[PDB]
């Protein structure tokens, strides 16, 4: 992820979605979830993937 | 017998030691660019569906 390697003509999104779309998944980054709740398929495809996240050293415990 | 006052120079000569420019080739980098990332070959699905 080092920025200024991936240009207007060169994308980031595109060099990714056809990583995806390699792996049979869709271009775009969206699977289609259902409900948990109603057991349905809902209408929109969600966008999921892998993030980083961090945990904060502020706690209510704390403060 | 003593040292008097001469004619006045008629000039200055000032040296110095001075070396000369090269071509202008301006070889910018060893391996140049920022080179673009790109897709492993083949890769194929790591994934299959149930069923």
Excluded: W
Aim: negative net charge; hydrophobic residues 35%.
């Amino acid at each position: 992820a080092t920025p200024f390697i991936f240009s207007e003509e060169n994308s980031a999104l595109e060099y990714f979605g056809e990583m995806l779309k390699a792996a049979g998944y869709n271009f775009y980054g969206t699977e289609r979830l259902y409900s948990g709740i109603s057991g349905l398929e809902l209408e929109a495809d969600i966008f999921i993937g892998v993030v980083y996240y961090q945990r904060l050293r502020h706690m209510v415990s704390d403060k | 017998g003593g040292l008097t006052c001469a004619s006045a120079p008629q000039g200055t000569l000032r040296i110095l030691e001075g070396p000369q420019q090269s071509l202008s080739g301006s070889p910018l980098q060893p391996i140049p660019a920022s080179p673009p990332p790109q897709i492993p070959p083949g890769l194929r699905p790591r994934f299959c569906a149930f069923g």
